[PDB]
């Protein structure tokens, strides 16, 4: 069943990987949001027109 | 470590392998022989004291 191990092996990381991205995206997004957030008070409020 | 970098490295190069072991007097002849056989099976170089 060594080959099964390789699947039993691989499928774990994939799963973890999915979960990892599941969090990572938010970690990126929440950061990006703040940039957008800062932008509104660092680009337009000073250049309203 | 090596397996991960297997893709980036061309197969023409097999990276140098070298570890250490101080106070080898702790080991028994069986353990030392097993270490030597494992290392050479893994093309592993050793520096033992």
């Amino acid at each position: 069943s060594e080959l099964v191990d390789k699947l039993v092996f691989d499928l774990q990381s994939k799963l973890d990987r999915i979960i990892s991205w599941g969090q990572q995206a938010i970690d990126l997004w929440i950061g990006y949001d703040r940039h957008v957030h800062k932008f509104i008070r660092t680009a337009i409020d000073m250049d309203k027109n | 470590w090596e397996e991960e970098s297997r893709r980036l490295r061309g197969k023409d190069i097999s990276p140098c392998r070298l570890l250490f072991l101080d106070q080898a007097a702790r080991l028994d002849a069986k353990s030392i022989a097993t270490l030597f056989e494992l290392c050479e099976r893994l093309q592993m170089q050793l520096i033992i004291a």
Binding site: S13, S20, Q24 | -
Partner: protein
Amino acid sequence: ELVSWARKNDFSISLPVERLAFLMAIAVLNSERLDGEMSE
């Protein structure tokens, strides 16, 4: 009707041998990647 849909959408693809090769390489690394993430 979909003709103008596409026309005003504007999209394209372009894979020279080297680019397509780089693509398979990135794909294989991702399949090998710990967390699927690829740093530049």
